[PDB]
């Protein structure tokens, strides 16, 4: 009876909290006619920010989120969006864009939180369902944030500013919302760590997916976070209303979403076949890359939005199968820090590559040489593992 009320509540929470109009116009935006901004500037100034904060910010992030109660830092991701979005609203110069990719850092590090929360808060027995039906909120109010944004400019013709204005409120709500759910009782963070780790470690199957999510993970946030500017450079923006980028981001959503409902229908039955599916899926994500690189045709953007779709539904779809490979052999108490640790190496491996390709003080290339030469990095992580594949392979002849 009582338990109905908060179980609502929760999923109302998220799907609000989802809804961002304008985080995926951000990026034109800082091109448009009305802000004084080169886009190499954006490339090789604004960008890496984000990713020198995200490694820097993570880490505390997370320690506080697990000593302090869940609400104290759900409630700061909200108010963080705050301040990015207000930091974007009157930005004035590059070094406001700066601050504002270091505000938009800590938004994205809090992500993990809110599925340890709904843990923590739920009944064990019941989590299963809650667990479900938040995640099926959370992925439905990111699929309907970007399609109202994107048809809120396109038929409405709305300025970029009102539409960030517009935005404004919702997160104004999103956060006063947040304030009110209740928190957790106590979920407060040990030599049976240290075993645990070692024992799972010796497993030979986790190891091959601790290195995809390494290596590939960051590879695919270089490229998500480059497309947009890409995107831009091929076609100038000289009407709000031709923009297409809102579009792009609910296709790959709901693309994601169907693939990754297909992962669990036969994650158990490819089990056996890993190293080639890897390789099979890393040859299609580096032929796209390489094709966003290629195209430079302004008639051709529309075969632009497809080619990055696809392959952001070709990542998606691997994301279920290594969540499960890796979680099955360790507990609900050891996955947080197993998932965290990769996740801190994937952003040091980030930074390095995002310092040397982009960063000024550096090689400093331009967008279009850069997607160049990550489609031969995509290229190398393919052969790589169809070269493990083969190796494997000969033994079992034998």
């Known amino acids: 009876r009582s338990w109905r009320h908060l179980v609502c509540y929760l999923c109302f929470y998220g799907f609000m909290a989802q809804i961002r109009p304008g985080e995926s116009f951000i990026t034109p935006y800082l091109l448009g006619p009305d802000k004084n901004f080169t886009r190499e500037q954006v490339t090789n100034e604004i960008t890496p920010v984000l990713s020198y904060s995200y490694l820097a910010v993570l880490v ?46 800590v938004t994205m590090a809090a992500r993990i939180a809110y599925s340890s929360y709904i843990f923590s808060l739920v009944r064990p027995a019941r989590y299963q369902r809650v667990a479900g039906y938040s995640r099926a909120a959370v992925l439905l109010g990111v699929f309907t944030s970007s399609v109202l944004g994107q048809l809120l400019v396109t038929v409405g013709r709305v300025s970029f500013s009102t539409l960030n204005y517009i935005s404004l409120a919702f997160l104004t709500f999103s956060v006063v919302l947040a304030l009110f759910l209740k928190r957790p009782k106590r979920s407060l963070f ?14 030979p199957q986790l190891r091959l997916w601790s290195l ?32 297409y980028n809102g579009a792009a981001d609910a ?32 040859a299609t994500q580096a032929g796209l890359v390489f094709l966003l690189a290629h195209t430079r045709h ?6 632009c939005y497809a080619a990055f779709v696809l392959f952001r539904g070709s990542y998606q779809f691997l994301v279920p199968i290594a969540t499960f490979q890796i979680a099955s052999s360790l507990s609900k108490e050891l996955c947080a ?27 400093g290339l331009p967008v279009r040489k850069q997607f160049q030469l990550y ?19 000969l033994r079992h002849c034998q």
Do not use: C
Request: aromatic share 16%; glycine share 6%.
């Open 251 to 282: 296709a790959s959503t709901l693309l994601g979403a169907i693939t990754s409902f297909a992962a669990g229908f036969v994650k158990i039955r490819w089990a056996r076949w890993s190293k080639l599916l890897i390789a099979g899926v890393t």
């Open 212 to 243: 995809w999510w390494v290596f590939n993970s960051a590879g695919y946030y270089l490229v998500v976070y480059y497309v947009h500017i890409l995107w831009n450079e091929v076609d100038p923006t000289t009407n709000s209303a031709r923009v």
């Open 337 to 363: 820090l197993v998932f965290g640790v990769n996740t801190f190496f994937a952003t040091i491996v980030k930074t390095i590559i995002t310092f040397i390709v982009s960063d000024v003080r550096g090689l």
């Open 298 to 303: 302004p008639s051709s953007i529309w075969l």
């Open 190 to 203: 040990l030599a049976r760590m240290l075993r645990e780790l070692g024992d799972s470690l010796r497993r």
């Open 60 to 105: 505390p992030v997370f320690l506080l989120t697990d000593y302090l109660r869940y609400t104290p830092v759900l409630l700061l991701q909200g108010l963080s969006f705050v301040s990015v979005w207000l930091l974007l609203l009157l930005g004035h110069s590059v070094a406001h864009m700066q601050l504002m990719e270091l505000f938009y850092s």
């Open 375 to 393: 489609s031969v990095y995509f290229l190398i992580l393919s052969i790589i593992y169809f070269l493990g594949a083969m190796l494997d392979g």
